[PDB]
Every structure is written in C-alpha cells, then in structure tokens.
Design a protein around this nucleic acid. Structure first.
Ligand SMILES: [K+]
Ligand SMILES: [K+]
Ligand SMILES: [K+]
Ligand SMILES: [K+]
Ligand SMILES: [K+]
Ligand SMILES: [K+]
Ligand SMILES: [K+]
Ligand SMILES: [K+]
Ligand SMILES: [K+]
Ligand SMILES: [K+]
Ligand SMILES: [Mg+2]
Ligand SMILES: [Mg+2]
Ligand SMILES: [Mg+2]
Ligand SMILES: [Mg+2]
Ligand SMILES: [Mg+2]
Ligand SMILES: [Mg+2]
Ligand SMILES: [Mg+2]
Ligand SMILES: [Mg+2]
Ligand SMILES: [Mg+2]
Ligand SMILES: [Mg+2]
Ligand SMILES: [Mg+2]
Ligand SMILES: [Mg+2]
Ligand SMILES: [Mg+2]
Ligand SMILES: [Mg+2]
Ligand SMILES: [Mg+2]
Ligand SMILES: [Mg+2]
Ligand SMILES: [Mg+2]
Ligand SMILES: [Mg+2]
Ligand SMILES: [Mg+2]
Ligand SMILES: [Mg+2]
Ligand SMILES: [Mg+2]
Ligand SMILES: [Mg+2]
Ligand SMILES: [Mg+2]
Ligand SMILES: [Mg+2]
Ligand SMILES: [Mg+2]
Ligand SMILES: [Mg+2]
Ligand SMILES: [Mg+2]
Ligand SMILES: [Mg+2]
Ligand SMILES: [Mg+2]
Ligand SMILES: [Mg+2]
Ligand SMILES: [Mg+2]
Ligand SMILES: [Mg+2]
Ligand SMILES: [Mg+2]
Ligand SMILES: [Mg+2]
Ligand SMILES: [Mg+2]
Ligand SMILES: [Mg+2]
Ligand SMILES: [Mg+2]
Ligand SMILES: [Mg+2]
Ligand SMILES: [Mg+2]
Ligand SMILES: [Mg+2]
Ligand SMILES: [Mg+2]
Ligand SMILES: [Mg+2]
Ligand SMILES: [Mg+2]
Ligand code: NA
Ligand code: NA
Lengths: 209, 114, 141, 64
RNA sequence: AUAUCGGUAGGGGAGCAUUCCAGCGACGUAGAAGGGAAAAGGGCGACUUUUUCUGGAGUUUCUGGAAAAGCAAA
RNA sequence: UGACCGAUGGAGUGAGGGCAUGGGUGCUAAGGUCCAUGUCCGAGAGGAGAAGAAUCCGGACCACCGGCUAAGGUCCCGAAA
RNA sequence: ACUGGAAAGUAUGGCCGAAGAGCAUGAAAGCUGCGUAUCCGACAUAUCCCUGAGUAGCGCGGGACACGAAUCCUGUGUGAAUGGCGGGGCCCAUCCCGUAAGGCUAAAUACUCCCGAGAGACCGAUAGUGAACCAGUACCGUGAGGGAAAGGUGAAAAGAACCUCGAACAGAGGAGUGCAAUAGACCCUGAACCCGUCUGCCUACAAGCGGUAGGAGCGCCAGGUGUGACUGCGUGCCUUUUGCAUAAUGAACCUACGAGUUACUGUUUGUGGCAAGGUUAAUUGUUGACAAGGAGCCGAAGCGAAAGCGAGUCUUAAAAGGGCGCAGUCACGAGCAGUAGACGCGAAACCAAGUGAUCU
RNA sequence: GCGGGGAACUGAAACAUCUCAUUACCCGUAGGAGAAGAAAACAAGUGAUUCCCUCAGUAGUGGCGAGCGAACGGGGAU
RNA sequence: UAAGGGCAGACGGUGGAUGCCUAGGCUCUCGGAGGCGAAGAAGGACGUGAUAAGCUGCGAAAAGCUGCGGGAAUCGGCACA
C-alpha cells in the first residue's frame, strides 16, 4: 500500500512510501499464525525438570519383611511408590520442546502478521533519526509526538543505533527490533508498529513473495 | 508442574456429606459409610417414584369403593356403568369428591344408576 | 487476531486419551485391557512373527533369489516429458529443470514429432525409432 | 531406536508395484514323484501373501 | 417429519475441575486465599455463582499453551 | 429396513449356563456329560407365582397424585364380584 | 489529602531515567535504605654399497574383528628373502596399490569433587536430596551395614509489673502490652475421624443393610426450617464368577500418599504448507531470532532370481495361453505398535564382591 | 581414559550354539584430558588421526532362530 | 416418668489437614580449574573462652599473633545473656 511519512515531531512531511502488496496486503492465515506463535514459545522453553524414579532412590534393595507368615501385606524394598517417601512414578523428565515448521509456513505466518497490522491500520512510518547522546526524554518525546505512548509499541530499525537503543531501553511499553530479525510473535505482541524509511525498504526487499 | 487439587477434592466430599445429614450412627458422617448409604437411597428413590403412582391409584380405588358401597353399588359395577355412559372423570377426582363432596358423588352415581 | 485470541483450525487439535480415571469416562477399571491373561499384564509385548507355537510363515516359506551388488539402474525419462521440456531449446540433457547425477534412459510413452538432438546414457529401440521418425538425433553416452 | 527388519522375512519376501507382497510356494511334500506333475502350481509361479496373513509380513518388514 | 435412546468386555463423541505459562482484562487492609453456615443455578453432569461469620495477605476472568491433571477397596 | 459387501484404524472374547426339541453316553439316573436346532441368563430392570439367574407376561430417555391392557386374579392380610 | 495500628495502597499534583533488575522497610515504592545503569580504582601476590630376524610365512589349539572359521593377535612347534615382499574375502595367473618387522606428535572429542556468575510454563516441609531443624544424627546390628522424625508468636519481646483463688502459677480469673492474647510460648490459619455441654423434637409392647416414598403432631425464623407418631417398599459395597445376601475375597475410621508416563523409530488418521516436485541434517554467518547449508531422503516405471529389456516384461521353439505392471512430499495434533523397568505392588531363586566361630 | 581378570538372572515363550555382555563387579595405573595418528591404506579415483550428520537397519552374519550389524562414498568440525 | 438413647443446631475440646510463606532441594547454561601428601595428606583424637561448651573457629603464640593495601564507628562467632 501507500503510507505517509511523519517526521520526528509528528508532522506530515509529504513524502510517501510504498509497501509490498505481497507482504502487507494478503489474506492472513490464522492457522499459520497459531503454529508460528506456538513454535516461538516452545523454543523459548527450558525444560529442566526432574523427579526421582525407583532406580535412583537412595534406599537399599533388601526385602523388608519375609514373603509369608507375618500377617501383613507382602513387601519388597523400601523404594516402592506405595510407601511414604517412596519413588515418584512417571514424574517429569528433562525435555527438549523444539519442533519443526516448514520455512514456507513460517514466511507465510510472518506475512500474515504484517498484513494484519497493515489492515488494522497500526503501522506508521517515521523518518530515520540519530541521537548525539542517549536521552530517554528525547525518545519519550518522539513516542508522544507519534501518539504511541498510550499502548505497547514496536520500533523497527534498519541498523544498530546504540544511542537510540539506550534511549528506548528504560521505557515500559516499547520494544526495538532490527528489520531483518522480524518474527510473527514480536509483530503480534505490540499494539502499534513504527517503521522507518529504510526499514520499509529492508522489509520489502527481504520478506517479499 | 505439580498439580494437586486439595480444595476441589475436599469440597466434593463435603457436598455429599451435607446430604447425608440425619442418618444413623456412622452413616451420617463417616465418608465411605455415608457415601455407600447415599447411593442405595438414590436407587430406592428411583424405584419409589414409580411405585408412588400405583399406591395413590390404589388409595383412590379403595375410597371410591367405600363411597359406592355407601350408595348401594360396588366399585366394579360403578366403573362399568361410568364407562358405558362414557364420562371421563378420573379416579383421583372421584375419590376427592367421595371424601370431600358427597353430594357431587351422589350426583355422579345417580346419573349412571339407571 | 492477536496473541489474546489465538485459534487453531477446526479439527486441527484433539485431546488425548486418559485411561483408569473413573467409570464416567468409559475407560476406568480394567482400563481397556479386558480381564486376565498375558495381554493384561504390565510389560506385555508381542513377539513379532510368533503365532502361538505353530510354524510361522516366515519360516515355512522358502528363501529365493539373490541380489546383484553391481547393479546398474537407469532413470526412465519418456518422450512426452521430453516434449514438455522442449516446449519452453533443442540440445537436450539439461537436467537442471529432472535428476541429480544419475544415468538416464529414454523410453517411448508419447510422441516427439519435433526434431531434437537427444543425448542420454541409454535408449530404447522404440525411442530411437520414434526419434528417427520425428527427424531427430540420438547421442548415446 | 529405529525398527529392525526381520532377516528371514527380508530373505523370503519382496514387494511389487501396487504394494502387494510376493512369495515362493512351499511344497506339500518336497519329494517330487509320488506327486502329480501339476506341481508347477507350487513350482513355477510366485504367489502373493493372503490378505488375512497380511500386516504380519508388514510388521516383519517394518510395515513396508 | 419420522424413527430411535436397557447394557458387561469393548469402540466412538463431547465436556468439567486442578497446577503453571503467554496475551488481554480485573479485584484486594473500605479485607485475598483458606475454614464454617446459608441460598441460588446447570439440555444434564463433572461443577459454578451470591450473602454472611472466621481469617489477615494475596487472588482472579476470557482465549490459547503445557502437564507431577481427579481414589472407596491393592 | 436400513445395515449386506470391499478396503482401512481400534478391540474384546476364545472357563459358559438353564429350558425346549433330535440324539449319543449313563441306569430311558443326576442341578450328570458330549453334539445339533432355537431361545433366554450371561450383559436385562418391571408384573404374577410366599420367598427362586434363565418357567409364564414383558425390553426401563426423564418427569406426572392421568388413562388402557398382558400373564394372573377379584372373602380378609392384599387392588378388583 | 483519604483509609488504616502502620502506606509503599487510592486520588491529585511533580521530578529522574545509559538507572522502571531486585531485596528490605509496620500492606503492593523508579524518587525511604541497600542497590541498579554508567564511570573510576591495586601496595603486594598470582594468571595470561646401505634399507629394522626367531621377524614375514607355515602346522596344531584358541582369540578379537558386525561375523558363530579374508584381515589382525599368539600358547605350542618351525622358519626365508634384499629389486624383493605384502594387500585387493579360500586357490593360481595378469593388473592395480603400498613399502612391515623403530619412535614422537596440537586441534576438533569425554567428564565435574571444586570455584565464580546466571537460569527454569522445576518442588514448596508425608513434596523436593535420606537430610530446610540436633542428619548419615537418634535408633538398630558382633560386624559389614541399615537408617528416621522434626520449619511458621508478633511490625517490634513490647514474652504478661501488680491483684484474686490455690500448698504451689498446677491451673485459671483479672490488670497491663499489643491492630489482635480465641497471637501467651506446643503460640499464623486451625478441616476430618474422634470426644463433650446446652437447646428443640422423638423414644421403655418393641424385631432384619437402617434408607426411600408417603404423613399427623410439636417447635423455631412467613413460606421456609428442626424433629417425627403411624403406613408402603427395601438381604451393604468391591472383586471374582455359569451363577454371590452369601457361611467366597477385601477393608477399624479419618486426613494425607498411591498405579498407561516419556524418548526414538514405524504405521493410520484430523488439520495445514508447498506441489511435479517436496524437504533439509550436521554445521556456518549477522545479531533466541533472521539468513545460509541440497549432503541425503521420498516421489517421478515396471517386469525378471539375474544378465537384461522396457509399457511392457517373465515363461516358450511360438503364442494374452498364463503372472505381474501400463500426486506426491514435509510438518503439527491424535490412535496403535516395537525397543527402553514401560500401568502398579508381590516371589521362591541365580550370580559377584565383602562381613561374621563374643552363640554354637 | 587406558589396561588385567570377568558372571548370572534374562531373551530364544523349555535349552546346550547364540543372547544378556567384551555389561555388573574386583584389581592395576595416567593426565588435564586420555587413547589414536602420518599407509607393506582404501578402493576399482581418494589420500594421517579424532568427533558429528548421512550412507543404513543397507552389505553381511546367525540352532540363517532370537538377534547382531558395518565399511566405501558424500557433507561438516579441526 | 425419661434411667439412658436418637436426630439437628450452637458453642467448645483434641488433632494438625488446608491456604499463604521459605534458599533447603532438583535440573541445567557459560567461564575457570582439575588434584592434596614425607616441608607429613584425607579423616580423626584431645584441648582452647569471664562464666559448662553443643556447634563454629583456632592449636600450648590455641574464637587467636605480624606487615602492607581498603575503610570509618562500633566491636568482642551462633544456639532470643
Ligand atoms: K408356593
Ligand atoms: K382387596
Ligand atoms: K528504594
Ligand atoms: K496471629
Ligand atoms: K502472618
Ligand atoms: K478447633
Ligand atoms: K425407616
Ligand atoms: K475361605
Ligand atoms: K570361643
Ligand atoms: K597421546
Ligand atoms: Mg538386590
Ligand atoms: Mg520423594
Ligand atoms: Mg501421571
Ligand atoms: Mg474405606
Ligand atoms: Mg465399557
Ligand atoms: Mg472398580
Ligand atoms: Mg482383575
Ligand atoms: Mg479367563
Ligand atoms: Mg485377554
Ligand atoms: Mg513385575
Ligand atoms: Mg428402551
Ligand atoms: Mg445406552
Ligand atoms: Mg471480613
Ligand atoms: Mg495460589
Ligand atoms: Mg484454557
Ligand atoms: Mg496424580
Ligand atoms: Mg484423597
Ligand atoms: Mg483355550
Ligand atoms: Mg472352551
Ligand atoms: Mg450341566
Ligand atoms: Mg437331563
Ligand atoms: Mg463374565
Ligand atoms: Mg439378553
Ligand atoms: Mg423377574
Ligand atoms: Mg380397566
Ligand atoms: Mg486516619
Ligand atoms: Mg500484613
Ligand atoms: Mg523430607
Ligand atoms: Mg507441684
Ligand atoms: Mg481467632
Ligand atoms: Mg492457632
Ligand atoms: Mg402384645
Ligand atoms: Mg409406647
Ligand atoms: Mg465355581
Ligand atoms: Mg441373589
Ligand atoms: Mg482368592
Ligand atoms: Mg476382613
Ligand atoms: Mg464380605
Ligand atoms: Mg484405607
Ligand atoms: Mg528362556
Ligand atoms: Mg470444631
Ligand atoms: Mg612454641
Ligand atoms: Mg591498616
Ligand atoms: Na470417548
Ligand atoms: Na438422654
């Protein structure tokens, strides 16, 4: 589609920008989005959980009581799960929660998320800016001028921009990401999406078709 | 993660123990005795809901028999005459009239005593 | 949608089966196992190829044949596929449009009717005759 | 671990194009003569695995 | 519209509760969870709401995700 | 009627029993035993037979303080001459 | 400013942010304390012609190699060559490859008693280590060895001066402290089984799983609630069985604990992505995410034991005379299977290394 | 890590070849790693060791039973 | 008449469930390091304090001695002095 660029203080400079239709104007795939978000969370998982089975308890393997003649229930060793302080049967084991999604499926999910944003009109394009020194107040002023301070916002940058990252580090509902590292979860997690002039070009050239 | 449903598990027992109130001895409050008593009572209740209709019909028939024998007829003869004359008043209404409205019962009897 | 209203496709997910958890589930008590015998015990497995003591079929049928450890197998490419490739060059065996470092053999399934210059490892007699009738060339290497 | 193929089955059975399993014929009596020359039925023609006996040869060959 | 709806072994379908997680909404010293009493509700049910006493600091809705995910008898 | 047949996913069962009929065996004994044809209990509640797994009547979606019948009954216990 | 015992809470109104991680503070703190982002800092002390002989080879008996008798090893007995010799799965010839009987060598690989910095859709006191506390302790055994239970006053000890009953704090009733003592030392919360007191109704002519369906009277708070004279029906439950009230099995009761799980490989199916193609594995770059990695795997032609031929092929001297042949792939969820202890508890036994003749 | 000795229960629905397994266990002895390593090699052109993914549950082996199970080649780390 | 008993409610007792809490566990990641000992080890015995020492620390110089660097008002280890 076509979008109007805003400057640092939220005035329409008049310069217009074009976004790829095959990226921002498709019919989104809900199942693809669901799968990609599930994969992202499962890949964030750290499965470091374990309980002790019968073979790893510390008690001896001696038979506690003789088999016949005592008058009570027959008993084996002390590590039995029927006894208090005994084995944990079918407890957790350490696990790897990663699973595979097709590359084309993941690309389609990314395009679907971007198209959802573009359709719901939560994408705005600002000019590229630099900071001489890290200034949280300057970044806050930019966000308030762009009117993205009420809710969660994601900025997409084309390069490192150490000063900008330091300025945005301490603000609560703001996130920063490079254009080439865009993913479906990060796009969907934020209410508003602020692209820069060069970020539009990078996204268009890299995630097209 | 570890999941134990302590509160739900206890609440399930406490709800049934509220219904076992009034029983005799351990059957009112001891869980495995009270639960056993409660279900047998539920089977009894299912059977008794069926047998209640039979019992009430028998009571109506006995009361109608008494009133008809006061009027000089038997229950079977009165019912035969009623069905021949084709009136559709049921046994509950007839017994209620017999016990509480004897003049109305006399009117019914005189209509079909021809 | 967003992260707060995620939804899978209808019928894409399904709850697993849990046994031994009461009478209402229909899978409690004996837990789908039946009553007694070997198959109801923990740790039962099937001996594959075991038929209760009768001589198994993989022991009462005979062994047959032998395999060649130096076997040349060609890849069958047909004249209809050759026509399809030719229709959007003449000198064939491009193979970049399909095999991957293998030996090719041309077979007769459709027709050619167009002058080609087909090169392949091997040919069928009907394939060579069809190429000649269509007015083409065969190079065998 | 991966499923292992039964060695005797892999030496006795083969697959066809439609997925049917072909096999050789065992003799009734393997001493020819005193058996009619119609023993070409079990001596010349490969047969197929019966559908009832199928899935057992499949599990033997790792469900292939 | 008509028909059908007793069930052991067993096959199939649809759901409730529990612990933790993400997102979105909320509640709390003007009283959270838990404990006692009472009342109401659910095609049906697993269960869920509301009032009050005790208690004195945490809890919870919806959608999706994952399981140390439910006892009456060994 | 509708579930007969193909192909595929999942099974359970492979200790049966009573009654009637045709038989073998036994002693023209057994609530015996072995087959065949039906049926019921198994897995089936309700009604009559005093009380009975399979004899007679009858297949329970839930509710009702409505009506008609089946087997079998109508002096009282106990509904109806 | 409000509520509160106490604000960090609520509502205004400000300020810092390269610091909105966290912990503590009388309730939940970016601005109260310790901290955090960032910057700075070490007197020492550490760390960075010649060419391998009891050899090659060989006989007998064995072993290791995926291999249960080519290669490699050797207990026993033998024993060369100096282009020669060895190998290419028995044995010979040609061919090809290599140069034994001397030695050394980093990297990529395995592991954690210990030290430091971190993390968890891991546990929260019958859980998690046997051990949150006095734990390998108490206790048991000649010995080797076996092996527990046990956390919580309160914000702050302010941990109750003094009075009364009593021989005494044995205990309690007050007073006082405290938001609260029904927070009083076993002290947060304080359930059940089990044990009492009071109040209401019933009960000394009555007979069976103790309920269920009817139904007077009495008694409480305005149509609900407690009890229940009297009437009908009714041989618990689980398991195992052809069949159980069974005099077949099983449980004293309550609370808590307790049994189809996970990994890999197949196969079927629900839903998806690409589609005559589908898909990457290990790994590599830039910063878990993006990008690269096509090796490999399945599909795309079959028939034949095979040479082979090919929409044919096999059988035949020859024949359709006969047999077999003329949209997939990659995932996600679910069912089933195999391999792992594989739904849980239970033998009698077998083997290995030790401890015991203080009894006999 | 290397080396010297070395079971049995179990599976094969009994059991003896086979399996469990060159495991458990006993004993000796290093280092920060150890072992291996520079062709009397594989093969039918590559070029010392080691490790990962494939080849592949394939070639073979086996009371040809239960089972066991490579290498060449290719892609990498170095 | 209730000797006693039954049911319900209220309030207690006992017991220590539940809820909330905890640095005590569990599983890992990254970086180091991979030994101690005849100059006497690991592991122990006996001592050592103002007041008995149960732990901790230390060793007849015995909850400790000396020097250099850091730092600035309390300190004299823990089991409620
Ligand atoms: K009789
Ligand atoms: K009567
Ligand atoms: K602070
Ligand atoms: K308190
Ligand atoms: K508290
Ligand atoms: K109490
Ligand atoms: K009664
Ligand atoms: K007995
Ligand atoms: K002696
Ligand atoms: K070395
Ligand atoms: Mg043992
Ligand atoms: Mg445990
Ligand atoms: Mg479980
Ligand atoms: Mg019980
Ligand atoms: Mg069933
Ligand atoms: Mg049961
Ligand atoms: Mg059983
Ligand atoms: Mg049986
Ligand atoms: Mg069975
Ligand atoms: Mg077992
Ligand atoms: Mg019916
Ligand atoms: Mg049904
Ligand atoms: Mg309150
Ligand atoms: Mg909670
Ligand atoms: Mg949910
Ligand atoms: Mg559980
Ligand atoms: Mg329980
Ligand atoms: Mg049998
Ligand atoms: Mg039989
Ligand atoms: Mg009989
Ligand atoms: Mg007879
Ligand atoms: Mg049965
Ligand atoms: Mg039946
Ligand atoms: Mg009957
Ligand atoms: Mg009638
Ligand atoms: Mg105030
Ligand atoms: Mg508080
Ligand atoms: Mg413990
Ligand atoms: Mg005294
Ligand atoms: Mg209180
Ligand atoms: Mg208390
Ligand atoms: Mg009398
Ligand atoms: Mg009396
Ligand atoms: Mg019997
Ligand atoms: Mg009976
Ligand atoms: Mg028994
Ligand atoms: Mg008993
Ligand atoms: Mg009994
Ligand atoms: Mg019990
Ligand atoms: Mg055996
Ligand atoms: Mg109480
Ligand atoms: Mg001295
Ligand atoms: Mg100094
Ligand atoms: Na089901
Ligand atoms: Na009394």
């Amino acid at each position: 589609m076509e979008l109007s660029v805003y400057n640092i203080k939220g005035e329409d400079t008049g310069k217009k920008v074009v976004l790829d239709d095959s990226i921002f104007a498709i019919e989104p795939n809900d199942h693809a989005i669901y799968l990609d978000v599930k994969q992202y969370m499962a890949n964030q998982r750290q499965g470091t959980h374990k309980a002790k089975e019968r073979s790893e308890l510390s008690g001896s393997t001696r038979k506690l009581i003789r088999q016949k003649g005592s008058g009570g229930a027959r008993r084996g060793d002390i590590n039995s799960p029927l006894l208090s302080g005994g084995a944990r049967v079918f407890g957790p084991r350490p696990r790897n929660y990663s699973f595979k999604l097709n590359k084309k499926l993941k690309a389609l999910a990314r395009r679907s998320a971007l198209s959802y944003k573009a359709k719901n009109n939560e994408i705005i394009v600002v000019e590229d800016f630099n900071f001489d020194a890290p200034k949280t107040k300057a970044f806050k002023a930019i966000s308030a001028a762009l009117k993205v301070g009420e809710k969660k916002v994601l900025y997409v940058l084309p390069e490192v921009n150490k000063n900008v990252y330091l300025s945005a580090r301490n603000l609560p509902n703001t996130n920063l990401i490079l254009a080439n590292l865009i993913n479906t979860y990060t796009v969907l997690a934020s209410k508003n999406l602020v692209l820069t002039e060069r970020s539009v070009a990078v996204v268009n050239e890299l995630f097209k078709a | 993660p570890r999941s134990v449903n302590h509160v739900a598990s206890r609440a399930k027992r406490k709800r049934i123990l509220k219904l076992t109130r009034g029983y005799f001895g351990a059957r009112k409050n001891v869980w495995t005795v009270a639960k056993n008593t409660w279900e047998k009572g539920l089977t009894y209740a299912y059977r008794d809901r069926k047998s209640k209709k039979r019992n009430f019909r028998a009571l109506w028939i006995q009361r109608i028999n008494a009133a008809a024998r006061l009027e000089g007829m038997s229950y079977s003869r009165l019912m035969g005459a009623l069905h021949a004359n084709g009136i559709e008043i049921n046994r509950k209404v007839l017994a209620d009239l017999a016990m509480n409205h004897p003049e109305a019962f006399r009117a019914i009897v005189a209509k079909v005593k021809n | 949608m967003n992260l707060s209203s995620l939804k899978p496709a209808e019928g894409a997910v399904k709850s697993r089966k849990r046994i031994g958890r009461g009478p209402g589930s229909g899978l409690g008590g004996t837990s789908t196992r039946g009553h007694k015998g070997a198959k109801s015990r923990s740790g039962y497995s099937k001996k594959i190829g075991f038929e209760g003591g009768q001589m198994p079929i993989q022991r009462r049928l005979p062994k047959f044949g032998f395999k060649n450890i130096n076997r040349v197998e060609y890849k069958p490419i047909n004249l209809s596929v050759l026509q399809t490739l030719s229709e959007a060059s003449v000198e064939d065996l491009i193979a970049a449009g399909v095999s991957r470092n293998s030996l090719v053999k041309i077979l007769a399934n459709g027709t050619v009717t167009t002058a080609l210059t087909v090169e392949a490892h091997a040919f069928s007699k009907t394939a060579e005759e069809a190429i000649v009738r269509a007015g083409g060339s065969v190079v065998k290497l | 671990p991966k499923l292992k193929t039964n060695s005797g089955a892999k030496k006795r059975f083969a697959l066809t194009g439609t997925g049917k399993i072909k096999r050789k014929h065992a003799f009734k009596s393997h001493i020819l003569t005193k058996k009619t020359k119609k023993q070409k039925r079990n001596l010349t023609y490969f047969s197929t695995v019966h559908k009832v006996d199928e899935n057992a040869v499949k599990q033997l060959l790792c469900l292939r």
